[PDB]
Symmetry: C2
Subunit: 262 residues, 2 copies
Amino acid sequence: LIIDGHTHVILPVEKHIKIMDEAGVDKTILFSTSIHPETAVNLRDVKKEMKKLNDVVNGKTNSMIDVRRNSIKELTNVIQAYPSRYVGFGNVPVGLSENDTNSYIEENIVNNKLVGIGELTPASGQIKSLKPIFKYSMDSGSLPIWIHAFNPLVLQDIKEIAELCKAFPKVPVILGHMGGSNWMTAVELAKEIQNLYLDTSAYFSTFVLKIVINELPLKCIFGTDMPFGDLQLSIEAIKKMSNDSYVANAVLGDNISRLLNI
Amino acid sequence: LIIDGHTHVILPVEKHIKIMDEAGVDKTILFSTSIHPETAVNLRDVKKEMKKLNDVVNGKTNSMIDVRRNSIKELTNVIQAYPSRYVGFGNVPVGLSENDTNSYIEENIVNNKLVGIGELTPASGQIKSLKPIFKYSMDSGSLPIWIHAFNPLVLQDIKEIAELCKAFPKVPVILGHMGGSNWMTAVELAKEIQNLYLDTSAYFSTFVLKIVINELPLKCIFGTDMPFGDLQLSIEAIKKMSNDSYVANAVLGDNISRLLNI
Ligand SMILES: [Zn+2]
Ligand SMILES: [Zn+2]
Ligand SMILES: [Zn+2]
Ligand SMILES: [Zn+2]
């Protein structure tokens, strides 16, 4: 009904549940994270944390295993506390072998009953390195893949993501952040490709947001990217930019409820 | 005074004055524009304008002097209609000779009584081409220079803008959009460099917005970037993210009132 389609685990968990309660939000799709800027005491510590997140988003940490496994453990432990309020996507190391990627997915995603894979943060130029994650999904239960697509991703990376969608048509793909500055191409590709959807989180223009959600009302998925975005402010923006209440309600939860079978 | 520090000319003008009125906004620093996506009815035309825009901001239109002479005439005529509500910045083509630069500025900026130069849209790697404009502003009334600093500017362009600030310490510089994904460096640079301010428009994270405005409460200038942003929405965000009402009142207008002597 309102489902936040993309938020990183927030601590203390009860503060986030209270923010959901106050915003009229039923459920959140939670994403693992190695980093908790929302708990940093003092500005120096916030910056330290934001600098580490910059490295992650830039793709410098992608082959690391243990940190992704600890963040899944955090994620499963958080969901277990509020299993009516949370569903989870778990992250998978990029740039491993097909064998090691499969076992990883089996142990850390399937065995934890997570509903999707992400948030992937490929380095620019390295989209093709995601093939084995698509392969696993093509086969075993078509888990949605969620891909960060704001900076540092450029136009050609968006195009390459599109090609993987076409090559693996049964695997749903959610494009993080509408493709950033590349939203015009992102919206064309999502119109064209059956299995490509767009996340709304981290829009930089309410006019771009208006154009994209009203052009693709059934394939845009509301998300806030907490702790980076604000739940009430983002909900308010969706409802103000939506051309009618159907569009608003589809983007705000009916689309992802349909997609994940919530 | 709440002042919108960065908005492009909106047509019809009375629509924009009404929005200001409803949002409790006293004045807007209005910036010229060659494209009007707000007057496009139907989606094909909107897309057509947004595309023309996307390559302006990317730096491809940077020598289309005719079109730009027309946009300044538009801006001067709009200002004349509500001279108590609007003050203007006028654009200057980026890559011209020192002589062709001082000629354009004299005719189009100084003669039209505009209070600043902008919004400049240098292509990535071309920040050094801006030197003539800094040189002229230094010889005229130290007119502020306002530079688009979201994509496609990268970190190195941001660093190069800072060097220009240091070479021209009396020329105020407003860094558009907090420097986008490069906001961590942008805010360090603005802390250290006397004449460098940050525009808040086109933030993509309210958390980033929060860190930046509370770290630099006296050098962040509220702007909405209409027609790309939404006045009421953006104001709400500033007030919600500000740590106190001083911070909010500075960012929302006192800062630009001081800098521009409004
Ligand atoms: Zn992301
Ligand atoms: Zn995220
Ligand atoms: Zn701009
Ligand atoms: Zn602008």
